[PDB]
RNA sequence: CACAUUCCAACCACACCUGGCGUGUGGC
């Protein structure tokens, strides 16, 4: 009876994590599913259990369309003269009343859908309460490890998922440690894990500076460009709004005091901290730094940049996997060309000659 | 604690409990051919004072109902047929189930 | 090798040590797994191990020596000892033991102790001849624990004010009555710093129960000594485990004639934990709290005393009020007058955002003539009489100004004359 | 120093039932 409904609404553990209104909404959905499974025909119904004043009373929704299939939930958009509709859409009736909500199959489907709804609501609430802190470094233990994704707990049953793309190729986890990342994606509609925390992205780097570098956070040393190779190398061009501060002595630290800390956080990532400039030439020179660039060729029609490096410093300007160039191509976003070594040493005073 | 004829039988699926009603008794006309629990008899083995809130919780959430012992009566292995009638007698004082 | 030198180092040190040992990529395992692997690799060269662990016994009979890395929980680094050693060397829970240990041998999986070297920083001779804790005679404190630093910086106020608000003595039973978000964290940080500067001889102990990891790491890097902590990543089991571990450690220390000063925060969370673990005895009162479930917190607050021949056990625990939880209310009610020192913090003054926020008329110490001298007590009486008629915010501003023009308490004393 | 063991991702171990005795009735 409805006394059982009051007992189950007052006997919930998460009383305010699932308010009485949403309790009764889930219970109405339960009773609607039960009544649907009762009749062989498909007919949508609403319950309106009358949370405090009275009992439930099933109804019959029409879903007004010009179709006729299963006319139990069909009625034309113009049937409005008799039965007192005077409507165009939304015409719903209250024909059937007082269904049964306490038999075996009804109780079973009610329990199932209530479990589903409470777990969904708890997950949605615990993710939304953290969604406001999107783009910040958060602590938290990892829960379970797998070859495709890992689970994390941020406290008070805060489930977070970190996919394989968010993890570095040699990033390592075991349930028990506090792997700290940055929240980047939220999906409050996801049927499963929806709290997305990353560490392989440059925004993570930014937040790292924010928790380590006192310069950033006051907009005195703006982080402009950032490219990453997970666990391999992070090229970050940060600009200095003032003049008496050098990023080599401020963002890098005191002989590798901050860059080393952020590298250990990133699992040994060579971090090249350079200065952002409004000139593409100096920008790409700092991108491939350290090196000895003696050429610059720009093409705005094809958006290409040719940099003829010096003969002998190949491993100093290209290195393994061409990272020193690849991240550069991922720093500014233009096609960078490093081909010549001895002949066509400039590609500007020789190619055009 | 006294016994119960509820339908909350843990350590078993729904197929063995599909023939049980909301009260905990096999329906009138439900066939059976092998050993099948046709009445949900459970008995407490440990502590009494299971709060009704936690009872409904266990019925919906949490873990299984511990003090049950799964002492429910099933038909012996070998007898078949369809049940045609069920009687029930409650002593003056015990809550009469809805089937009674 | 020694285990403590693997204890005090961070994770990157273990990484490079394993790389020196020619080990597989070990960045994936726990710190204790790395320590276990490194110790196995070191003993494979024919070496013995040196370890140090606090002892704990279950009904199973044998004992486990835990480290402070996991705040005294089970792990691959803890040492397993047979009941024979406990029977022989008269061991018991909380008795920290340091000595020779070996990696687990054929079929074993945890370390085993070979020869005891230091029983609570003492030879087994006088360790076996240990006076029992409950068999002792409690006393009151005459040794005054001066909270004043003497440097007189911007925050030292919160310490020196206690020198005129709540005197601190060895073995004092102190309790803080304060609403959340009032300034208790920095308060206990200040008290720990001050007691470590003025009294570095007494072993410092701080209890972080049911707290956030940021506070855990901030307090493990600011206290002037070894600390223990416990976050909410595990249920009340870890909380009650660490509570028993720390209480038996303090008991064994004070039995070894030590001066222990434990700082607990917060005690309402310990009460909640003890409620959650202990089964219901069939009787519950208002607040959803069992009757005899508070017996363990009671005991924990009753462990504070003053030993006659030497040593003391001071306990300073913080309680949470004004949280709206009537449960918590009842808890504080159970803790109405169990301690002889009250530190009352009010949210009304803290909302005016001046620190500290002392409830002078509500706070005090029972039987305080036995702590300080006669002139200091007379000046305390004079200050109390001056502060009683006025309110609380004006009184706090008055005290702050008076202790801001001056640095040591003698200046304020003579200025009050 | 030595004896002896060492308490926890699926799961192996933690299973399943009245002729005690009598009487009555019936059948071969």
Short mmCIF file of N, CA and C in Angstrom, two decimals, chain A residues 137-138 150 152 162-163 165-168 171-173 178-184 196-205 208 228 230-231 262-269:
data_model
loop_
_atom_site.label_atom_id
_atom_site.label_comp_id
_atom_site.label_asym_id
_atom_site.label_seq_id
_atom_site.Cartn_x
_atom_site.Cartn_y
_atom_site.Cartn_z
N UNK A 137 43.70 20.77 -11.30
CA UNK A 137 44.37 19.58 -10.80
C UNK A 137 43.65 19.09 -9.55
N UNK A 138 43.30 17.81 -9.54
CA UNK A 138 42.58 17.19 -8.44
C UNK A 138 43.37 15.98 -7.96
N UNK A 150 41.38 3.04 -16.65
CA UNK A 150 41.58 2.88 -15.22
C UNK A 150 40.52 3.70 -14.48
N UNK A 152 39.30 5.71 -10.81
CA UNK A 152 39.84 6.56 -9.76
C UNK A 152 38.73 6.94 -8.79
N UNK A 162 39.85 7.17 -16.53
CA UNK A 162 40.98 7.68 -17.29
C UNK A 162 41.27 6.67 -18.39
N UNK A 163 41.05 7.07 -19.64
CA UNK A 163 41.18 6.17 -20.77
C UNK A 163 42.65 5.98 -21.13
N UNK A 165 44.13 6.76 -23.87
CA UNK A 165 44.71 7.93 -24.52
C UNK A 165 45.12 8.99 -23.51
N UNK A 166 44.42 9.08 -22.38
CA UNK A 166 44.81 10.02 -21.33
C UNK A 166 46.07 9.55 -20.61
N UNK A 167 46.29 8.24 -20.53
CA UNK A 167 47.50 7.71 -19.93
C UNK A 167 48.64 7.72 -20.93
N UNK A 168 49.84 8.04 -20.46
CA UNK A 168 51.02 7.95 -21.30
C UNK A 168 51.28 6.49 -21.66
N UNK A 171 52.96 5.37 -18.73
CA UNK A 171 52.39 5.78 -17.46
C UNK A 171 51.89 4.56 -16.70
N UNK A 172 52.08 4.56 -15.39
CA UNK A 172 51.93 3.35 -14.60
C UNK A 172 51.03 3.62 -13.40
N UNK A 173 50.17 2.66 -13.08
CA UNK A 173 49.19 2.81 -12.02
C UNK A 173 49.04 1.52 -11.23
N UNK A 178 48.11 8.10 -5.35
CA UNK A 178 47.33 9.29 -5.66
C UNK A 178 47.84 9.87 -6.99
N UNK A 179 47.32 9.32 -8.08
CA UNK A 179 47.63 9.83 -9.41
C UNK A 179 46.77 11.06 -9.66
N UNK A 180 47.41 12.22 -9.79
CA UNK A 180 46.72 13.49 -9.92
C UNK A 180 46.74 13.95 -11.37
N UNK A 181 45.56 14.29 -11.89
CA UNK A 181 45.44 14.81 -13.24
C UNK A 181 44.54 16.02 -13.30
N UNK A 182 44.03 16.36 -14.48
CA UNK A 182 43.15 17.50 -14.65
C UNK A 182 41.85 17.02 -15.28
N UNK A 183 40.72 17.47 -14.74
CA UNK A 183 39.42 17.16 -15.32
C UNK A 183 39.25 17.91 -16.63
N UNK A 184 38.90 17.18 -17.70
CA UNK A 184 38.83 17.82 -19.01
C UNK A 184 37.49 17.60 -19.70
N UNK A 196 36.10 12.40 -16.70
CA UNK A 196 37.27 12.21 -17.55
C UNK A 196 38.42 13.09 -17.07
N UNK A 197 39.48 12.45 -16.58
CA UNK A 197 40.67 13.13 -16.09
C UNK A 197 41.84 12.72 -16.97
N UNK A 198 42.65 13.69 -17.37
CA UNK A 198 43.77 13.44 -18.26
C UNK A 198 45.06 13.96 -17.66
N UNK A 199 46.17 13.44 -18.18
CA UNK A 199 47.51 13.93 -17.87
C UNK A 199 48.40 14.07 -19.10
N UNK A 200 48.02 13.52 -20.25
CA UNK A 200 48.83 13.57 -21.46
C UNK A 200 48.59 14.83 -22.29
N UNK A 201 47.71 15.71 -21.85
CA UNK A 201 47.35 16.90 -22.61
C UNK A 201 48.10 18.12 -22.09
N UNK A 202 48.31 19.13 -22.94
CA UNK A 202 49.07 20.31 -22.49
C UNK A 202 48.34 21.14 -21.45
N UNK A 203 47.01 21.15 -21.45
CA UNK A 203 46.29 21.84 -20.40
C UNK A 203 46.70 21.32 -19.03
N UNK A 204 46.89 20.01 -18.91
CA UNK A 204 47.45 19.45 -17.69
C UNK A 204 48.73 20.19 -17.32
N UNK A 205 49.67 20.27 -18.26
CA UNK A 205 50.89 21.05 -18.04
C UNK A 205 50.56 22.42 -17.46
N UNK A 208 49.68 22.25 -13.99
CA UNK A 208 50.88 21.95 -13.23
C UNK A 208 51.60 23.23 -12.88
N UNK A 228 52.95 18.39 -27.09
CA UNK A 228 53.33 17.28 -26.23
C UNK A 228 53.61 16.02 -27.03
N UNK A 230 53.80 12.19 -25.43
CA UNK A 230 53.57 11.63 -24.08
C UNK A 230 54.78 10.87 -23.56
N UNK A 231 55.25 11.29 -22.38
CA UNK A 231 56.44 10.73 -21.78
C UNK A 231 57.73 11.04 -22.50
N UNK A 262 58.00 19.16 -12.64
CA UNK A 262 56.91 18.87 -13.57
C UNK A 262 57.26 17.67 -14.45
N UNK A 263 58.54 17.44 -14.71
CA UNK A 263 58.93 16.27 -15.49
C UNK A 263 58.72 14.98 -14.69
N UNK A 264 59.11 14.98 -13.41
CA UNK A 264 58.81 13.82 -12.57
C UNK A 264 57.31 13.60 -12.45
N UNK A 265 56.53 14.69 -12.40
CA UNK A 265 55.08 14.54 -12.41
C UNK A 265 54.61 13.89 -13.70
N UNK A 266 55.19 14.27 -14.83
CA UNK A 266 54.85 13.71 -16.13
C UNK A 266 55.63 12.44 -16.45
N UNK A 267 56.36 11.89 -15.48
CA UNK A 267 57.10 10.67 -15.69
C UNK A 267 58.29 10.83 -16.61
N UNK A 268 59.14 11.81 -16.32
CA UNK A 268 60.35 12.02 -17.10
C UNK A 268 60.09 12.53 -18.50
N UNK A 269 59.60 13.76 -18.61
CA UNK A 269 59.31 14.39 -19.90
C UNK A 269 60.22 15.60 -20.07
#
